Design a binder for this molecule. Structure first.
Ligand code: MOO
Length: 232
């Protein structure tokens, strides 16, 4: 059986891995998941990578595929939500109020950088930049970013203590005890973090829609819920 090829936002690593396994247990159909920034995956799909299912960490990259005729609106829907958090290495004693003018910048110390997803394209980066701008803190850190290929690459910098602070999703923090949540960004400091899922129009896999539909079922939802995602 040809596996269902799922391209999933980096932040979906453990949950979609668990989901892939559970789906195959239930149906006998293997699921092969590729993770990267949602931007990277969407671009790869647009350029003809043979994916069956796409899950983005934001609306924009799903819109991107839709506008290119690769996703039909009927075959897309919102699945998950998240929060945006400021994290530090687990052993860090930093206390930071993201609303306080210059507090994020000061917490970077003399030469530290703020680990973020690449802000122009990586959903976690663009949510972070939106939050930082909304809170008036962007200029104080915009030359002090450690822009990373995905939210999980950002998380890894913080886990290693190579960035004293980073901006990741709540679920990322839950996924890595080597970081700690210093603060949660106000929900209204950025667009709602929403993960749309879609069957790709060009998919020939007989299980593509089945897999997407299955993500709505209790045990599939429970994976994401256990892992700290909200359910749409
Ligand atoms: O597409 Mo991500 O889960 O913001 O790196």
């Amino acid at each position: 059986t040809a596996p269902v090829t799922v391209f999933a936002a980096a932040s979906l690593k453990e949950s979609m891995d668990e989901a892939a396994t559970a789906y195959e247990k239930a149906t006998g159909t293997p699921v092969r998941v590729s993770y990267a920034a949602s931007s990277a995956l969407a671009r790869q799909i647009e350029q003809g990578a043979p994916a069956d299912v796409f899950l983005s960490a934001d609306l924009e990259w799903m819109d991107y595929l839709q506008q290119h005729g690769l996703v039909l609106p009927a075959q897309r829907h919102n699945l998950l939500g998240n929060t945006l958090v400021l994290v530090a290495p687990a052993s860090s004693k930093l206390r930071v109020d993201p609303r306080a003018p210059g507090a994020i910048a000061k917490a970077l110390g003399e030469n530290g950088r703020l680990a973020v997803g690449q802000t122009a394209s990586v959903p976690a980066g663009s949510y972070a930049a939106a939050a930082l701008r909304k809170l008036g803190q962007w200029d104080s850190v915009s030359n002090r970013l450690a822009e990373s290929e995905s939210v999980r690459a950002a998380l890894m910098l913080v886990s290693r203590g190579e960035a004293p602070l980073g901006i990741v999703y709540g679920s990322d923090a839950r996924a890595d005890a080597k970081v700690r949540v210093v603060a949660t960004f106000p929900d209204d400091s950025h667009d709602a973090i929403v993960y749309p899922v879609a069957a790709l129009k060009n998919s020939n896999n007989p299980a593509t829609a089945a897999f997407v539909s299955w993500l709505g079922s209790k045990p599939a939802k429970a994976i994401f819920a256990r892992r700290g995602f909200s359910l749409k």
